[PDB]
Design an enzyme around this catalytic site. Structure first.
Site, mmCIF file in Angstrom:
data_model
loop_
_atom_site.group_PDB
_atom_site.id
_atom_site.type_symbol
_atom_site.label_atom_id
_atom_site.label_comp_id
_atom_site.label_asym_id
_atom_site.label_seq_id
_atom_site.Cartn_x
_atom_site.Cartn_y
_atom_site.Cartn_z
ATOM 1 N N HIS A 1 0.826 -1.233 0.000
ATOM 2 C CA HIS A 1 0.000 0.000 0.000
ATOM 3 C C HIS A 1 0.851 1.270 0.000
ATOM 4 O O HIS A 1 2.075 1.187 0.139
ATOM 5 C CB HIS A 1 -0.999 0.016 1.158
ATOM 6 C CG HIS A 1 -0.397 0.047 2.539
ATOM 7 N ND1 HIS A 1 0.425 -0.948 3.039
ATOM 8 C CD2 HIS A 1 -0.605 0.915 3.570
ATOM 9 C CE1 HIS A 1 0.738 -0.670 4.300
ATOM 10 N NE2 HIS A 1 0.112 0.444 4.653
ATOM 11 N N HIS B 1 1.373 3.906 1.991
ATOM 12 C CA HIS B 1 1.852 4.626 3.152
ATOM 13 C C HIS B 1 3.368 4.683 3.122
ATOM 14 O O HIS B 1 4.011 3.708 2.673
ATOM 15 C CB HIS B 1 1.369 3.939 4.415
ATOM 16 C CG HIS B 1 -0.067 4.246 4.734
ATOM 17 N ND1 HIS B 1 -0.849 3.428 5.517
ATOM 18 C CD2 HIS B 1 -0.837 5.318 4.421
ATOM 19 C CE1 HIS B 1 -2.049 3.968 5.648
ATOM 20 N NE2 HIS B 1 -2.072 5.105 4.979
ATOM 21 N N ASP C 1 5.880 4.459 5.142
ATOM 22 C CA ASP C 1 6.677 3.399 5.775
ATOM 23 C C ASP C 1 6.618 2.078 5.006
ATOM 24 O O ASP C 1 7.240 1.101 5.420
ATOM 25 C CB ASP C 1 6.272 3.170 7.226
ATOM 26 C CG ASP C 1 4.858 2.740 7.361
ATOM 27 O OD1 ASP C 1 4.008 3.390 6.705
ATOM 28 O OD2 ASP C 1 4.575 1.782 8.129
ATOM 29 N N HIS C 2 5.915 2.062 3.874
ATOM 30 C CA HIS C 2 5.862 0.875 3.013
ATOM 31 C C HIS C 2 6.339 1.171 1.585
ATOM 32 O O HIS C 2 6.653 0.265 0.849
ATOM 33 C CB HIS C 2 4.443 0.236 3.039
ATOM 34 C CG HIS C 2 4.014 -0.170 4.415
ATOM 35 N ND1 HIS C 2 4.057 -1.475 4.858
ATOM 36 C CD2 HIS C 2 3.551 0.567 5.453
ATOM 37 C CE1 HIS C 2 3.667 -1.517 6.127
ATOM 38 N NE2 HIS C 2 3.358 -0.290 6.517
ATOM 39 N N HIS D 1 -7.551 -0.423 5.028
ATOM 40 C CA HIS D 1 -6.512 0.380 5.635
ATOM 41 C C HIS D 1 -6.123 1.527 4.665
ATOM 42 O O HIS D 1 -5.960 2.687 5.102
ATOM 43 C CB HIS D 1 -5.337 -0.522 5.995
ATOM 44 C CG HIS D 1 -4.152 0.190 6.573
ATOM 45 N ND1 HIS D 1 -4.082 0.589 7.893
ATOM 46 C CD2 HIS D 1 -2.971 0.560 6.010
ATOM 47 C CE1 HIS D 1 -2.910 1.160 8.128
ATOM 48 N NE2 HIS D 1 -2.213 1.156 6.999
ATOM 49 N N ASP E 1 -0.490 -3.855 5.972
ATOM 50 C CA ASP E 1 -1.165 -3.416 7.184
ATOM 51 C C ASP E 1 -2.626 -3.864 7.184
ATOM 52 O O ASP E 1 -3.426 -3.243 7.847
ATOM 53 C CB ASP E 1 -1.041 -1.888 7.378
ATOM 54 C CG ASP E 1 0.363 -1.446 7.741
ATOM 55 O OD1 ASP E 1 1.268 -2.305 7.844
ATOM 56 O OD2 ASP E 1 0.545 -0.213 7.838
ATOM 57 N N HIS F 1 4.252 -5.162 10.184
ATOM 58 C CA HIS F 1 4.879 -4.707 11.434
ATOM 59 C C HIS F 1 4.979 -5.800 12.489
ATOM 60 O O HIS F 1 4.221 -6.783 12.464
ATOM 61 C CB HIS F 1 4.055 -3.604 12.069
ATOM 62 C CG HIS F 1 3.941 -2.374 11.232
ATOM 63 N ND1 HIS F 1 4.807 -1.302 11.347
ATOM 64 C CD2 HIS F 1 3.054 -2.049 10.266
ATOM 65 C CE1 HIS F 1 4.432 -0.356 10.493
ATOM 66 N NE2 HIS F 1 3.378 -0.795 9.816
HETATM 67 ZN ZN LIG Z 1 -0.260 1.616 6.494
HETATM 68 ZN ZN LIG Z 2 2.532 0.263 8.289
#
Ligand SMILES: [Zn+2]
Ligand SMILES: [Zn+2]
Length: 279
Positions: free
Chosen positions: A68, A70, A72-73, A125, A150, A196
């Site tokens: 996805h 975001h 951090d990905h 998400h 996530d 995570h």
């Molecule tokens: Zn996320």
């Molecule tokens: Zn994440």
């Protein structure tokens, strides 16, 4: 002090769990039949991927896949791709993923070497989140790597930033029934690679909330919880669990079992999902 670990699928392929940022996992897929490498969920902290390939490992590193949008990905897609091929960047069509060259939707497949990567739509998400189901077509019984980002964690689910409980129920239904076509024979060799290290908090939740104290699933949750915590204690990732395991310990996934919905007695599946989410 976070260590990598490597999950192997017969002689066909391996998935290396790479701890990134504070609690993220990125992954390296290694197709042993063609020596082709792919990364999953590359963020700003991407160098640990290189250090692994580096220290532990003639290779083609051809693909990056993003579960996805975001940061951090996906925050390392462009920077990792820049070095130096061509590198295909895969991401869900509706998430507008940074640096994507292969937008994907439900049912699409891409190849990583001889490995197949099947795409499952899981909006919730994010509106465009997907899951990646990875296996070797010529070695189906060696198992399946499922990258859940996530959407699903061990014993858990992600926050519904761009969606709702209906969306998460649908996602859980899809994951639950992946192997319906083989009478769930492959559940025990399907391994879950989430976004995570959130396993601790979710297993504590499963142990507290499991409704049937007469079932040995309680004892199982308890043993699994301790197992994961001891891994985290030595620096080792809690991940992966198998889908067979998740179907016991992941109460959110178990919303896709009508008997479990009836046992919880907190309304229909949608009501129950909201009950669990809010608890
Ligand atoms: Zn996320
Ligand atoms: Zn994440």
């Amino acid at each position: 002090m976070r260590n990598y670990c490597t999950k192997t699928f017969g002689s066909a392929f391996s998935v290396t769990v790479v701890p990134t940022l504070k609690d993220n996992f990125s992954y390296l897929i290694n197709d042993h039949t063609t020596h082709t490498l792919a990364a999953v969920d590359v963020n700003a902290d991407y160098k640990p991927i290189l250090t692994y390939i580096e220290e532990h490992l003639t290779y083609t590193f051809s693909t990056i896949l993003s579960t996805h949008k975001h940061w951090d990905h996906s925050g390392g897609n462009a920077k990792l791709k820049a070095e130096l091929v061509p590198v295909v960047v895969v991401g869900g069509a509706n998430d507008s993923i940074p640096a994507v060259t292969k937008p994907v939707r439900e049912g699409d497949r891409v190849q990583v070497g001889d490995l197949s990567v099947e795409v499952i739509d899981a909006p919730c998400h994010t509106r465009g989140h997907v899951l990646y189901k990875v296996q070797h077509p010529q070695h189906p019984n060696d198992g399946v790597a499922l990258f859940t980002g996530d959407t699903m964690f061990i014993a858990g689910i992600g926050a519904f930033f761009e969606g709702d409980e209906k969306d998460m129920c649908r996602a859980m239904e899809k994951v639950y029934h992946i192997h319906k076509g083989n009478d769930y024979a492959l559940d025990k060799v399907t391994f879950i690679f989430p976004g995570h290290e959130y396993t601790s908090g979710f297993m504590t939740f499963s142990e507290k909330t499991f409704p049937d104290r007469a079932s040995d699933d309680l004892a199982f949750i308890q043993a699994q919880r301790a197992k994961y915590a001891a891994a985290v204690k030595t620096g080792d990732p809690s991940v992966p669990s198998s889908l067979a395991e998740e179907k016991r310990q992941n109460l959110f996934l178990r919303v896709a079992d009508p008997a479990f919905v009836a046992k919880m007695n907190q309304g229909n599946a949608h009501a129950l999902m909201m009950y669990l989410y809010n608890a």
